Amino acid sequence: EYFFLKIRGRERFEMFRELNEALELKDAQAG
Amino acid sequence: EYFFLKIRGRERFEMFRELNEALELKDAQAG
Amino acid sequence: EYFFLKIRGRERFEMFRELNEALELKDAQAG
Amino acid sequence: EYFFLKIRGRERFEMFRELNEALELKDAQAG
């Protein structure tokens, strides 16, 4: 549970940031 | 630069983990 | 302007399939 | 397997395009 991950790239973060927020919303909307 | 990103999930993390390692490889092939 | 992309792989396509469905549902929330 | 997906997003497509080319390059080195 919970796996910290650091990346030297703000660009990749923006991507993973959208995938993380988009993946969490699917669970709340889908259940 | 280094931006932390708490990823809770084996698949989700594996995604950003594979995307991070895959993105770094492109730099070697491209420049 | 549609850009057909022949995804080679069940996992690869499944990935973009989840990113496409999540990006489409997320866009509805914004505008 | 070869799947066919139609992406109506310039940015979204570029993502899967970079993810498919990056995931295909890493798979070639292993497989």
Side-chain angles (χ1 to χ4, degrees):
Chain A
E1 217 92 314
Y2 267 62
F3 315 85
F4 296 84
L5 189 81
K6 60 263 145 198
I7 311 94
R8 51 158 263 287
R10 60 257 218 65
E11 199 145 314
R12 334 216 233 293
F13 167 100
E14 270 220 30
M15 181 222 316
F16 315 134
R17 183 69 201 282
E18 283 174 288
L19 274 94
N20 269 308
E21 279 207 43
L23 271 151
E24 188 194 338
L25 271 149
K26 271 145 73 262
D27 268 44
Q29 64 110 259
Chain B
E1 277 258 36
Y2 268 102
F3 310 79
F4 281 62
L5 179 86
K6 292 153 217 87
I7 309 138
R8 181 219 306 166
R10 56 170 68 197
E11 217 139 23
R12 191 142 51 261
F13 166 100
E14 273 260 48
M15 256 100 76
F16 319 144
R17 181 85 206 74
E18 274 165 70
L19 262 141
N20 194 24
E21 182 148 71
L23 266 144
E24 288 159 324
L25 260 291
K26 195 208 287 88
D27 207 76
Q29 270 262 47
Chain C
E1 211 194 321
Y2 292 69
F3 315 75
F4 229 135
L5 203 54
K6 55 227 269 261
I7 311 298
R8 195 204 98 166
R10 49 253 304 283
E11 208 212 274
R12 213 67 84 270
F13 166 100
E14 186 264 26
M15 205 106 78
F16 317 136
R17 207 266 198 198
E18 275 209 26
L19 268 147
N20 199 33
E21 64 190 67
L23 271 151
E24 206 265 282
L25 64 81
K26 187 215 276 264
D27 269 67
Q29 301 292 55
Chain D
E1 206 139 64
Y2 268 91
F3 312 78
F4 271 102
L5 192 62
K6 64 198 85 215
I7 312 302
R8 64 137 71 198
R10 182 80 214 197
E11 281 202 87
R12 245 182 277 173
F13 170 101
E14 277 184 48
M15 214 205 283
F16 318 140
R17 218 285 175 286
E18 268 83 272
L19 267 94
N20 187 17
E21 60 97 281
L23 273 155
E24 185 270 284
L25 273 157
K26 181 216 270 262
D27 195 338
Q29 292 206 357

